[PDB]
mmCIF file of C-alpha atoms and ligand atoms in Angstrom:
data_model
loop_
_atom_site.group_PDB
_atom_site.id
_atom_site.type_symbol
_atom_site.label_atom_id
_atom_site.label_comp_id
_atom_site.label_asym_id
_atom_site.label_seq_id
_atom_site.Cartn_x
_atom_site.Cartn_y
_atom_site.Cartn_z
ATOM 1 C CA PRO T 1 102.140 68.613 102.263
ATOM 2 C CA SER T 2 98.327 70.422 103.747
ATOM 3 C CA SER T 3 96.248 72.711 102.072
ATOM 4 C CA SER T 4 93.549 73.092 105.476
ATOM 5 C CA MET T 5 93.904 77.035 106.480
ATOM 6 C CA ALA T 6 91.885 76.793 109.542
ATOM 7 C CA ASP T 7 94.515 74.022 110.780
ATOM 8 C CA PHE T 8 97.299 76.645 109.813
ATOM 9 C CA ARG T 9 95.578 79.134 111.731
ATOM 10 C CA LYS T 10 95.370 77.249 114.849
ATOM 11 C CA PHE T 11 99.551 76.988 115.446
ATOM 12 C CA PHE T 12 99.294 81.176 114.397
ATOM 13 C CA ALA T 13 97.058 81.768 116.767
ATOM 14 C CA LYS T 14 99.625 80.639 119.449
ATOM 15 C CA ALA T 15 103.103 81.420 117.680
ATOM 16 C CA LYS T 16 105.346 83.630 119.810
ATOM 17 C CA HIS T 17 108.786 83.915 116.885
ATOM 18 C CA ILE T 18 107.410 84.122 113.466
ATOM 19 C CA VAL T 19 109.907 84.118 110.482
ATOM 20 C CA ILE T 20 108.648 84.956 107.249
ATOM 21 C CA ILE T 21 110.827 84.398 104.385
ATOM 22 C CA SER T 22 109.685 86.608 101.120
ATOM 23 C CA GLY T 23 110.962 85.987 97.399
ATOM 24 C CA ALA T 24 110.786 87.110 93.988
ATOM 25 C CA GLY T 25 106.800 86.500 93.942
ATOM 26 C CA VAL T 26 105.894 89.198 95.898
ATOM 27 C CA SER T 27 107.393 92.156 94.270
ATOM 28 C CA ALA T 28 106.220 90.433 90.715
ATOM 29 C CA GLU T 29 102.473 90.605 92.242
ATOM 30 C CA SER T 30 103.317 94.755 92.782
ATOM 31 C CA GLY T 31 104.812 94.849 89.176
ATOM 32 C CA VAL T 32 108.038 94.360 89.915
ATOM 33 C CA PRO T 33 109.991 92.867 87.135
ATOM 34 C CA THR T 34 112.614 89.947 88.849
ATOM 35 C CA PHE T 35 113.927 88.803 85.590
ATOM 36 C CA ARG T 36 114.119 85.027 87.165
ATOM 37 C CA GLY T 37 112.283 83.424 83.910
ATOM 38 C CA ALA T 38 111.061 81.665 82.120
ATOM 39 C CA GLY T 39 109.835 85.300 80.619
ATOM 40 C CA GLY T 40 112.041 87.331 82.696
ATOM 41 C CA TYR T 41 114.523 89.196 80.709
ATOM 42 C CA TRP T 42 116.264 92.131 80.466
ATOM 43 C CA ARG T 43 117.103 92.655 76.850
ATOM 44 C CA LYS T 44 118.518 89.280 76.326
ATOM 45 C CA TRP T 45 119.740 88.064 79.467
ATOM 46 C CA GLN T 46 117.874 87.506 83.369
ATOM 47 C CA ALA T 47 119.740 88.279 86.859
ATOM 48 C CA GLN T 48 121.996 85.359 86.667
ATOM 49 C CA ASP T 49 123.717 86.542 83.569
ATOM 50 C CA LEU T 50 124.171 90.160 84.969
ATOM 51 C CA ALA T 51 123.958 89.821 88.601
ATOM 52 C CA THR T 52 127.619 88.180 88.752
ATOM 53 C CA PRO T 53 131.552 89.383 89.122
ATOM 54 C CA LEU T 54 132.200 88.042 85.812
ATOM 55 C CA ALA T 55 129.974 90.199 84.409
ATOM 56 C CA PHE T 56 130.537 93.282 86.067
ATOM 57 C CA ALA T 57 134.504 92.634 85.559
ATOM 58 C CA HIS T 58 133.536 92.402 81.408
ATOM 59 C CA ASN T 59 131.283 94.655 80.954
ATOM 60 C CA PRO T 60 130.578 97.507 84.311
ATOM 61 C CA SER T 61 128.265 99.729 81.974
ATOM 62 C CA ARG T 62 125.843 96.781 80.890
ATOM 63 C CA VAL T 63 125.295 95.690 84.827
ATOM 64 C CA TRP T 64 125.195 99.428 85.772
ATOM 65 C CA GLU T 65 122.355 99.817 82.755
ATOM 66 C CA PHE T 66 120.604 96.900 84.395
ATOM 67 C CA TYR T 67 120.782 97.952 88.268
ATOM 68 C CA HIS T 68 119.879 101.408 86.468
ATOM 69 C CA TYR T 69 116.818 100.536 85.392
ATOM 70 C CA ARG T 70 115.919 98.377 88.033
ATOM 71 C CA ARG T 71 116.394 101.758 90.694
ATOM 72 C CA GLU T 72 114.289 103.492 88.085
ATOM 73 C CA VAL T 73 111.356 101.625 87.336
ATOM 74 C CA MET T 74 110.643 101.602 91.086
ATOM 75 C CA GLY T 75 108.943 105.213 91.236
ATOM 76 C CA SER T 76 106.060 103.935 90.201
ATOM 77 C CA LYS T 77 105.982 101.052 92.400
ATOM 78 C CA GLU T 78 103.808 99.928 95.450
ATOM 79 C CA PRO T 79 103.609 97.475 98.327
ATOM 80 C CA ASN T 80 101.324 94.878 97.625
ATOM 81 C CA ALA T 81 98.259 93.764 99.865
ATOM 82 C CA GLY T 82 100.735 90.492 100.643
ATOM 83 C CA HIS T 83 103.404 92.755 102.078
ATOM 84 C CA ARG T 84 100.944 94.949 104.051
ATOM 85 C CA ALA T 85 99.579 92.045 105.629
ATOM 86 C CA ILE T 86 103.266 91.058 106.767
ATOM 87 C CA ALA T 87 104.016 94.694 107.777
ATOM 88 C CA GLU T 88 100.666 95.140 109.740
ATOM 89 C CA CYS T 89 101.109 91.821 111.160
ATOM 90 C CA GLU T 90 104.198 92.379 112.835
ATOM 91 C CA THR T 91 102.903 96.239 114.397
ATOM 92 C CA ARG T 92 99.358 93.731 115.499
ATOM 93 C CA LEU T 93 102.090 90.591 116.526
ATOM 94 C CA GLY T 94 105.017 93.312 118.669
ATOM 95 C CA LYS T 95 102.114 94.924 120.911
ATOM 96 C CA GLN T 96 101.497 91.530 122.068
ATOM 97 C CA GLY T 97 104.731 90.595 123.065
ATOM 98 C CA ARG T 98 104.793 88.405 119.810
ATOM 99 C CA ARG T 99 108.363 88.751 117.341
ATOM 100 C CA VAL T 100 107.838 89.118 113.651
ATOM 101 C CA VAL T 101 110.763 88.815 111.509
ATOM 102 C CA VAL T 102 111.364 88.853 107.342
ATOM 103 C CA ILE T 103 114.085 87.805 106.292
ATOM 104 C CA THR T 104 114.285 88.892 102.223
ATOM 105 C CA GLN T 105 115.614 87.323 99.352
ATOM 106 C CA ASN T 106 114.204 90.897 97.532
ATOM 107 C CA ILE T 107 116.791 94.199 96.596
ATOM 108 C CA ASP T 108 113.523 96.232 95.644
ATOM 109 C CA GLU T 109 113.175 97.832 99.682
ATOM 110 C CA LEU T 110 109.267 97.237 98.905
ATOM 111 C CA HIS T 111 108.516 95.315 102.508
ATOM 112 C CA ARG T 112 109.956 98.403 104.169
ATOM 113 C CA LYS T 113 108.450 100.512 102.006
ATOM 114 C CA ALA T 114 105.159 98.803 103.452
ATOM 115 C CA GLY T 115 106.217 100.205 106.768
ATOM 116 C CA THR T 116 108.308 96.773 107.725
ATOM 117 C CA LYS T 117 110.627 97.112 110.672
ATOM 118 C CA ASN T 118 112.309 93.745 111.374
ATOM 119 C CA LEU T 119 113.890 93.256 108.096
ATOM 120 C CA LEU T 120 117.104 90.970 106.972
ATOM 121 C CA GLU T 121 117.781 92.218 103.149
ATOM 122 C CA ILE T 122 120.345 89.296 102.379
ATOM 123 C CA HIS T 123 121.245 90.040 99.374
ATOM 124 C CA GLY T 124 121.187 94.243 99.612
ATOM 125 C CA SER T 125 119.216 96.679 98.006
ATOM 126 C CA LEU T 126 119.003 98.315 94.730
ATOM 127 C CA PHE T 127 119.222 101.768 96.305
ATOM 128 C CA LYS T 128 122.745 101.292 98.000
ATOM 129 C CA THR T 129 125.999 101.391 96.639
ATOM 130 C CA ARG T 130 129.656 99.759 97.663
ATOM 131 C CA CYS T 131 132.774 101.310 96.374
ATOM 132 C CA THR T 132 135.130 99.016 94.895
ATOM 133 C CA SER T 133 138.045 100.365 95.929
ATOM 134 C CA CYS T 134 137.463 102.067 100.052
ATOM 135 C CA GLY T 135 134.707 99.559 100.479
ATOM 136 C CA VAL T 136 132.453 102.101 102.001
ATOM 137 C CA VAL T 137 128.682 101.195 101.727
ATOM 138 C CA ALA T 138 125.968 104.108 101.212
ATOM 139 C CA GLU T 139 122.239 104.514 100.259
ATOM 140 C CA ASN T 140 121.425 106.208 97.109
ATOM 141 C CA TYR T 141 118.511 106.791 96.049
ATOM 142 C CA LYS T 142 119.110 109.103 92.953
ATOM 143 C CA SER T 143 117.573 109.791 89.726
ATOM 144 C CA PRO T 144 119.708 109.185 87.852
ATOM 145 C CA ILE T 145 122.478 107.638 89.572
ATOM 146 C CA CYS T 146 124.779 109.153 87.750
ATOM 147 C CA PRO T 147 124.653 111.351 84.531
ATOM 148 C CA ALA T 148 126.069 109.492 81.923
ATOM 149 C CA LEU T 149 123.235 107.181 82.865
ATOM 150 C CA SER T 150 120.707 109.569 81.753
ATOM 151 C CA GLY T 151 118.076 107.928 79.618
ATOM 152 C CA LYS T 152 120.129 104.574 79.337
ATOM 153 C CA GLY T 153 118.925 101.146 80.575
ATOM 154 C CA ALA T 154 115.872 100.136 78.055
ATOM 155 C CA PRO T 155 115.107 96.866 78.564
ATOM 156 C CA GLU T 156 113.769 96.248 74.484
ATOM 157 C CA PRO T 157 116.626 93.894 72.865
ATOM 158 C CA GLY T 158 118.306 95.018 69.853
ATOM 159 C CA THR T 159 118.847 98.154 72.905
ATOM 160 C CA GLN T 160 122.639 99.094 71.843
ATOM 161 C CA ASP T 161 125.294 98.949 75.050
ATOM 162 C CA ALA T 162 125.906 102.899 76.145
ATOM 163 C CA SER T 163 129.196 101.834 76.904
ATOM 164 C CA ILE T 164 129.493 104.622 79.328
ATOM 165 C CA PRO T 165 133.565 104.043 79.965
ATOM 166 C CA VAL T 166 133.907 103.324 83.904
ATOM 167 C CA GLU T 167 135.681 106.967 84.513
ATOM 168 C CA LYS T 168 132.116 108.046 83.707
ATOM 169 C CA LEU T 169 130.010 105.361 85.637
ATOM 170 C CA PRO T 170 128.967 106.035 89.391
ATOM 171 C CA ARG T 171 131.739 106.982 91.336
ATOM 172 C CA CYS T 172 133.038 107.341 94.925
ATOM 173 C CA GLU T 173 132.231 110.543 97.005
ATOM 174 C CA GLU T 174 134.739 110.211 99.652
ATOM 175 C CA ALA T 175 137.344 112.860 99.345
ATOM 176 C CA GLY T 176 140.422 111.478 97.549
ATOM 177 C CA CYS T 177 138.519 108.349 96.955
ATOM 178 C CA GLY T 178 136.875 107.871 93.211
ATOM 179 C CA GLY T 179 136.674 104.622 93.182
ATOM 180 C CA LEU T 180 133.913 102.895 90.525
ATOM 181 C CA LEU T 181 130.564 102.115 92.862
ATOM 182 C CA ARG T 182 128.645 98.836 92.192
ATOM 183 C CA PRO T 183 125.023 98.348 93.436
ATOM 184 C CA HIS T 184 125.472 96.473 97.364
ATOM 185 C CA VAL T 185 123.464 93.449 96.234
ATOM 186 C CA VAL T 186 124.905 89.881 95.898
ATOM 187 C CA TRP T 187 125.737 88.446 93.339
ATOM 188 C CA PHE T 188 125.846 84.861 91.769
ATOM 189 C CA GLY T 189 129.194 83.296 92.494
ATOM 190 C CA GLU T 190 129.760 85.942 95.645
ATOM 191 C CA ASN T 191 128.980 85.458 99.796
ATOM 192 C CA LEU T 192 126.596 86.626 101.865
ATOM 193 C CA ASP T 193 127.143 88.645 104.797
ATOM 194 C CA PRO T 194 127.986 86.547 107.518
ATOM 195 C CA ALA T 195 126.508 89.006 109.927
ATOM 196 C CA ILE T 196 123.818 88.809 108.185
ATOM 197 C CA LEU T 197 123.440 84.922 108.134
ATOM 198 C CA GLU T 198 124.080 84.574 112.223
ATOM 199 C CA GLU T 199 121.153 86.389 112.552
ATOM 200 C CA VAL T 200 119.046 84.994 110.055
ATOM 201 C CA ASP T 201 120.538 81.609 111.921
ATOM 202 C CA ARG T 202 119.600 83.008 115.646
ATOM 203 C CA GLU T 203 116.218 83.501 113.910
ATOM 204 C CA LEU T 204 115.549 79.543 112.556
ATOM 205 C CA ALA T 205 116.796 78.963 115.784
ATOM 206 C CA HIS T 206 114.560 80.829 117.858
ATOM 207 C CA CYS T 207 111.184 80.653 115.437
ATOM 208 C CA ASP T 208 108.377 78.082 116.115
ATOM 209 C CA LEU T 209 106.508 79.524 113.176
ATOM 210 C CA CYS T 210 107.575 79.602 109.278
ATOM 211 C CA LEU T 211 106.137 81.207 106.516
ATOM 212 C CA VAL T 212 107.472 81.011 103.286
ATOM 213 C CA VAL T 213 105.979 83.470 100.714
ATOM 214 C CA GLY T 214 106.551 83.709 97.258
ATOM 215 C CA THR T 215 109.854 81.421 96.931
ATOM 216 C CA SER T 216 110.824 79.284 93.494
ATOM 217 C CA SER T 217 113.378 77.671 96.366
ATOM 218 C CA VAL T 218 115.716 77.804 93.900
ATOM 219 C CA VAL T 219 118.642 80.284 95.116
ATOM 220 C CA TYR T 220 120.817 79.172 97.829
ATOM 221 C CA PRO T 221 121.774 79.522 100.699
ATOM 222 C CA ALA T 222 117.929 80.951 100.912
ATOM 223 C CA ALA T 223 116.607 78.041 99.719
ATOM 224 C CA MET T 224 117.778 76.007 102.626
ATOM 225 C CA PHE T 225 116.439 78.015 105.632
ATOM 226 C CA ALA T 226 112.907 77.684 105.715
ATOM 227 C CA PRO T 227 113.933 73.442 105.206
ATOM 228 C CA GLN T 228 116.420 73.602 108.144
ATOM 229 C CA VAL T 229 112.685 75.599 110.291
ATOM 230 C CA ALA T 230 110.785 72.461 109.240
ATOM 231 C CA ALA T 231 113.978 70.126 109.788
ATOM 232 C CA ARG T 232 113.518 70.981 113.840
ATOM 233 C CA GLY T 233 109.494 69.874 113.773
ATOM 234 C CA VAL T 234 108.405 73.588 113.161
ATOM 235 C CA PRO T 235 105.766 74.161 110.871
ATOM 236 C CA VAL T 236 106.656 75.291 107.262
ATOM 237 C CA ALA T 237 103.544 77.276 105.554
ATOM 238 C CA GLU T 238 104.684 77.992 102.118
ATOM 239 C CA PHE T 239 102.528 80.734 100.230
ATOM 240 C CA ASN T 240 102.959 80.057 96.385
ATOM 241 C CA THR T 241 101.638 80.362 92.855
ATOM 242 C CA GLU T 242 103.600 77.255 91.660
ATOM 243 C CA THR T 243 104.433 74.441 93.669
ATOM 244 C CA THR T 244 108.396 74.188 94.632
ATOM 245 C CA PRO T 245 111.792 71.310 94.831
ATOM 246 C CA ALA T 246 110.919 72.615 98.754
ATOM 247 C CA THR T 247 107.304 71.804 99.307
ATOM 248 C CA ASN T 248 106.796 68.432 100.140
ATOM 249 C CA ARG T 249 109.355 69.308 103.168
ATOM 250 C CA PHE T 250 106.768 71.463 104.522
ATOM 251 C CA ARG T 251 103.550 71.417 106.301
ATOM 252 C CA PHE T 252 101.423 73.495 104.469
ATOM 253 C CA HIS T 253 100.810 74.575 101.019
ATOM 254 C CA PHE T 254 98.770 77.277 100.339
ATOM 255 C CA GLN T 255 98.227 78.205 96.284
ATOM 256 C CA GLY T 256 97.812 81.961 94.709
ATOM 257 C CA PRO T 257 99.015 84.985 94.867
ATOM 258 C CA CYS T 258 100.371 86.004 98.497
ATOM 259 C CA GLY T 259 98.633 89.283 98.270
ATOM 260 C CA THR T 260 95.444 87.503 98.325
ATOM 261 C CA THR T 261 96.152 84.523 100.642
ATOM 262 C CA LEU T 262 98.095 86.600 103.551
ATOM 263 C CA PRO T 263 95.574 89.150 104.208
ATOM 264 C CA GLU T 264 93.108 86.363 105.755
ATOM 265 C CA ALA T 265 95.645 84.047 106.481
ATOM 266 C CA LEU T 266 97.894 86.839 109.181
ATOM 267 C CA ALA T 267 94.373 88.931 110.241
ATOM 268 C CA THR R 1 131.033 75.189 104.234
ATOM 269 C CA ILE R 2 127.742 77.299 103.901
ATOM 270 C CA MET R 3 127.699 78.024 99.859
ATOM 271 C CA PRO R 4 127.851 81.442 97.773
ATOM 272 C CA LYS R 5 124.808 82.014 96.188
ATOM 273 C CA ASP R 6 123.806 79.430 94.012
ATOM 274 C CA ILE R 7 121.115 78.916 91.460
ATOM 275 C CA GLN R 8 119.934 75.254 91.626
HETATM 276 ZN ZN1 ZN G 1 135.582 104.725 97.997
#
């Protein structure tokens, strides 16, 4: 693919419907542990080990420890220059009658914290719960999410399983439900929300410009989103520290932290 | 036909 910014900036100068798809690179640049590999571990596991309905079924305490860690750690993280540039870009192009939509794979809400409005969080949120009994989805920023998790979730291996009994894990507070809560996060082996997918479809169908920022394009179906946009001929710009299995299907490929390239690229 | 969330 090209690495010519002047040429990217041509299309960008005129684009009316920009779709910006983001992945864990963008969060990593804020200091958010994304447990992707080849050295993204929590104790002895990575996301694909613990972010699964099987992991949750067999050890709900350990999965809760993991997401508890990840919730707490966010207290000190801020959005980075890439987040801000995306958010200001939206605000600016907005005024000019031009559309910017963010489609994120990330569950950390940094795009929201930065000021992004048109945000599709296709894999859910660290700060939302769903009740496994009644299905209610609720925002939850509570630190700690429950008393029994106070002081738990330490990432060092060797760390002992808290083994909270399920009664003392996060429970639904809807009168007379009592159900066990889970993170409102799309796990491996689960479906994305079809209502969210239809939105994403509408956005990809109607876009004239597409950016794919800090994604390693190995997570499906999100990995198909940008290639689909390049398949109607629409230019896709990959912003990434590395090349990916998707790279040669795109128009551009800008190397480096999204924090460095995006503020230039979306000025 | 769309598949569940997977790592390839
Ligand atoms: Zn409930």
